[PDB]
């Protein structure tokens, strides 16, 4: 249905809702490696990553605070990619420059110097995605 | 201008990440007692959270005080629930909504959700036969869906 892609998660809590929502909403999960702990699908680095799945970097979108890409406008597709980053430092600076900047997605947030916890990022993102589709698949 | 009430929560790290969500979001926070765990100050700290992210907090002491004291308009409030429900997202929602979530576990007690008629009774959409979503993350559904209605008014 859509791709949730983890980059080198942290905490173990926010891997496990994660799946749950992917288990809920039909979502593929993809974890990158490094984990910070010990359809899913673990890929060794983001290089293996790519050769394996080989994305449509059309359909990829980096979900950061830095982000300039509004999530209010935004279209999303059946296979999307939607790249998520660590729990301390977010996504490294040098992957989110791969993406064109209307790719760099921000959700909105009250004024001020914050985040949304990540699997909550998650879940947002996938069921905005999931009710563009009309819920197909769900009861 | 949003309300997230908790009914009897039950993992403390479940009301810590709503409390954060509602500070990132601008909603207002609820709790209804019995909870399943002690809430002080020290430990909010120790948690991470600001004294002023968590200080507009309402606890109520049970449901028919909460009532009582904040007289949510009932047509305005959802409660969380499987019995005779409608799926959330086909709902329009307005500001100052109120959105009714029972413990993670337990779910709203069938005396509770009774008092709702079926009309304000809202699930969100889930593939057949999977657990439900962690608590923290269905809030954060609810409340982005809500706010997406209202144009991210004040969001950026
Ligand atoms: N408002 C928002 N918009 C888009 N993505 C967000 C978000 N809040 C959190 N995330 C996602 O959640 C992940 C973990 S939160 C990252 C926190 C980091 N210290 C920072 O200041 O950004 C992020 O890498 C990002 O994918
Ligand atoms: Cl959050
Ligand atoms: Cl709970």
Same mark, same amino acid.
Do not use: K, Y
């Given at each position: ?49 790519? !050769?394996? $799945?080989?994305? &449509?970097?059309?359909?990829?979108? #980096?979900? %950061? ?7 209010? +406008? /935004? !279209?999303? $597709?059946?296979? &999307?990619?939607?790249?998520?980053? #660590?729990? %301390? ?7 989110? +420059? /791969? ?41």
């Amino acid at each position: 249905m859509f791709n949730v892609v983890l980059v080198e998660p942290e905490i173990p809590p926010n891997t496990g809702n994660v799946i749950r929502l992917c288990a809920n909403t039909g979502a593929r999960l993809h974890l990158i490696e490094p984990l910070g702990f010990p359809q899913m699908r673990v890929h060794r680095d983001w290089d293996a990553f790519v !050769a394996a $799945e080989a994305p &449509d970097p059309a359909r990829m979108f #980096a979900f %950061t605070t830095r982000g300039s890409g509004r999530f209010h +406008d /935004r !279209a999303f $597709e059946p296979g &999307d990619w939607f790249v998520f980053g #660590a729990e %301390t430092r977010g996504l490294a600076p040098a992957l989110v +420059d /791969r993406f064109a900047p209307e790719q760099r997605v921000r959700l909105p947030m009250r004024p001020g110097n914050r985040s949304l916890n990540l699997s909550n990022t998650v879940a947002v993102v996938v069921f905005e995605a999931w009710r563009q589709a009309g819920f197909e698949g769900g009861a």
